[PDB]
Amino acid sequence: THEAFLECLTTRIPSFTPQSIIYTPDNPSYSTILDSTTQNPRFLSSSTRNPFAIITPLHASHIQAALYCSQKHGEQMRIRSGGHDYEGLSYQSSVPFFILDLRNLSSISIDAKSKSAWVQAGATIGELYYGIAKTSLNLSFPGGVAHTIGVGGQLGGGGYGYSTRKYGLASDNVIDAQLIDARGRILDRKTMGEDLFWAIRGGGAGSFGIVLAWKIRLVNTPSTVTIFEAVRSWENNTTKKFIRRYQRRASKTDKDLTIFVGFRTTSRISILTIVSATFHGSKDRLLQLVQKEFPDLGLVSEECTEMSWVRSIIHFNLFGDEVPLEVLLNRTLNMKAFKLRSDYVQKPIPDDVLEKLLSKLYDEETGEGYIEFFPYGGKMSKISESEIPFPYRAGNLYNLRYMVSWKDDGNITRTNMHLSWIKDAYDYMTPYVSKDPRGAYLNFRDLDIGVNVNESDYDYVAKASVWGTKYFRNNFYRLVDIKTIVDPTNFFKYEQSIPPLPPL
């Protein structure tokens, strides 16, 4: 159906042919556009991954047209930049929808003098890092690691990486933005006002408008960085001491050092402790620091490598060792299905509890389960809980992520056994993670913490506060009042959209 919507589009798009940016299931390149940024393969066989149209705007005016026609005739929009949402909310809906796909809005301009950049929402962080590196090796931006993450989604939900302890989240370093609200107005920080500019910086911008471009602060980094890659046996009692110390110290060591820890089973079947890190400093200083503060890791100089910050990004994207061209960061032409959940840890997990936790990896097939620690101290502890809607600051030792990966047979029953393994691991940890409410991280989206009910239900707001206070805490109620002002008719809505107050 949707005749009135589709006809209104070709009419309102300034013509140089609108049918070029409008893909429908008949068009042979519709399947390729849909698949290319379906980033979690578990949704490849999803029956709700069936937009009736995909629109690829080339200018702001195409977004305004798609917006105007969409509210006029009641059809539903899913915004997609990089497509990396872990629940695939940018390309799935239970009701008929179209995708507004921002891939062709990916222009980047950099001002080295004032250490700032403009990035359009369809750019990946790989393209941004490439542009920054071609300008200076003393400039960084703390986005994530994986080079195909879209800046559209990432900067609207937080953005954690190897340099967050030094610089804060990607959202903490946004200084302006171009946002298109429900009325089709193109606003920036001055005209959108401070409440809305607060809300889009980690509150989930897609609840409030279509971010056209972000303006970011570029940060100063030393020209060379040191990484280490290290593997230890979890059965080694000295590494168990290291993990004991890590829980208490990784969030409190030098802000220039961020250490990630992961666990998976290998090979007759044992658990590996995976340890990786970036240090904004020299190798000699890295070895002195880690040996004084984490001696049970037994870090050896052969585990450490000095390189430029952008090269450290390229290495952690699994290129290199025999290094490829820097233009690697531009190749978005990038495979197992996965489910993940996460938790905030504020008190060290007791040793016996961590053992039982990790023992659950044996119950999944070898190497499929994965448990990771991402430390939160440093700058994250110097920023208030309401500076932006992201509230997990001081008092958080690390974010604990659970993940299970698999190859999809088509068999629902066997796919459900993996979902059931994660749920089991998450339920077991209930008494040892944050409580009231159990915290979760927006950019590690998880529908199992709760979803919206129907917007006409009388308890739509309170139901939304179930997941809403897990992502945001007391910042949720301020997001609701802001949503009421900028989107009173609730055009921007999905399974975990901030609700506006019911109209009086």
Ligand SMILES: *Cc1cc2c(cc1C)nc1c(=O)[nH]c(=O)nc-1n2C[C@H](O)[C@H](O)[C@H](O)COP(=O)(O)OP(=O)(O)OC[C@H]1O[C@@H](n2cnc3c(N)ncnc32)[C@H](O)[C@@H]1O
């Ligand atoms: C797939 C993935 C994700 C990922 C990661 C590695 C991989 C392989 N590593 C991450 C990391 O190290 N640190 C981190 O904090 N997150 C990491 N992620 C997750 C990823 O960064 C987030 O999921 C992010 O939101 C993804 O953004 P992207 O833009 O790529 O994804 P999307 O599906 O298209 O959109 C995400 C949500 O935001 C809304 N959206 C998208 N664009 C806009 C604009 N322009 N305006 C408003 N809302 C927008 C989508 O509708 C969706 O809800």
